[PDB]
Design an enzyme around this catalytic site. Structure first.
Site, short mmCIF file in Angstrom:
data_model
loop_
_atom_site.label_atom_id
_atom_site.label_comp_id
_atom_site.label_asym_id
_atom_site.label_seq_id
_atom_site.Cartn_x
_atom_site.Cartn_y
_atom_site.Cartn_z
N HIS A 233 45.39 61.65 71.73
CA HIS A 233 45.50 61.79 73.20
C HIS A 233 46.90 62.29 73.61
O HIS A 233 47.89 62.11 72.88
CB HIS A 233 45.20 60.44 73.88
CG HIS A 233 46.30 59.44 73.67
ND1 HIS A 233 47.43 59.41 74.46
CD2 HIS A 233 46.48 58.50 72.72
CE1 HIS A 233 48.25 58.48 74.02
NE2 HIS A 233 47.71 57.92 72.95
N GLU B 263 42.21 52.63 69.62
CA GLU B 263 43.45 52.41 68.92
C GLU B 263 43.45 51.04 68.21
O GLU B 263 42.78 50.11 68.64
CB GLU B 263 44.62 52.47 69.92
CG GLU B 263 46.03 52.28 69.30
CD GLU B 263 46.33 53.27 68.16
OE1 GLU B 263 45.53 53.34 67.20
OE2 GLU B 263 47.36 53.99 68.22
#
Ligand SMILES: [K+]
Length: 250
Positions: free
Chosen positions: A11, A89
């Site tokens: 990202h 994550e």
């Protein structure tokens, strides 16, 4: 029987990234202005690729990056973005939102090295890797079910893809192509699983230090998978690394 490309993108930058605060599963921050720019640059870089499939973590920073990449794409408007929580994550528990330096202090105070250490409430490295393994199993099954038109009996030699330093490296004649948008720690762990744990080929001139480096915001990696079905179990017979943590677009 099925060959497909997988492009993997971290990202774009958040304010947490900029301030070097740990960002895991609990703080769902958006892209910063910088992140929007990096995502657009990655979208422009990948604009001439047809992504037949797109997978993103459930976290806003990743979703926004995927949306910007697809908005900039010239071929993939009919492709649905699939949210998969398995791509989130690594969890950092009580360390999340604290300076990355605080995690180092916690590791120290607990007597373990930064690599052995998992903070309370956090995920261990094996737990993150198990998530990627589950993701791969799901990925293979979905690619296989959808791309019957691409299945081939023809086997090849594990020779090197064409790597010219361009966005289509290694995928020039690979029409089936998945995009995965995820997070730095997860991607790092996943890359090591692909390269070290599995049978894997890596191209001429690619340094292991690069292969195993941390991924920058919107850093781009590419693997080509060949998958076989045996006993209704799907397995990768060949995994070819093409490039890792590329950031030419930045
Ligand atoms: K290996």
């Amino acid at each position: 029987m099925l060959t497909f490309a997988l492009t993997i993108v971290r990202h774009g930058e958040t304010q947490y990234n900029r301030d070097k605060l740990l960002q895991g599963q609990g703080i769902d921050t958006p892209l910063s202005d910088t992140g929007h720019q990096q995502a657009a640059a990655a979208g422009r870089y990948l604009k001439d690729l047809h992504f037949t499939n797109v997978f993103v973590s459930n976290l806003q920073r990743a979703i926004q990056t995927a949306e910007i990449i697809l908005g900039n794409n010239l071929h993939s408007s009919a492709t649905e973005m699939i949210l998969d929580p398995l791509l989130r994550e690594r969890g950092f528990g009580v360390a999340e939102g604290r300076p990355k330096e605080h995690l180092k202090n916690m590791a120290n105070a607990a007597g373990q090295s930064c690599r052995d250490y998992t903070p309370p409430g956090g995920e261990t490295l094996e737990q993150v890797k198990t998530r990627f393994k589950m993701f791969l199993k799901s990925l293979f099954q979905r690619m296989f079910e959808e791309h019957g038109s691409a299945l081939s009996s023809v086997p090849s030699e594990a020779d090197q893809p064409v790597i010219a330093g361009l966005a289509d490296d290694g995928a020039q004649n690979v029409p089936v192509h998945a995009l995965m948008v995820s997070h730095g720690a997860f991607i790092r762990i996943s890359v090591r699983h692909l390269v070290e744990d599995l049978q894997c080929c890596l191209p001429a001139g690619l340094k292991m230090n690069q292969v195993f480096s941390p991924c920058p915001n919107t850093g781009i990696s590419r693997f080509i998978f060949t998958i076989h079905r045996e006993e209704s179990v799907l397995r990768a017979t060949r995994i070819q690394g093409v490039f890792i943590n590329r950031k030419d677009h930045l």
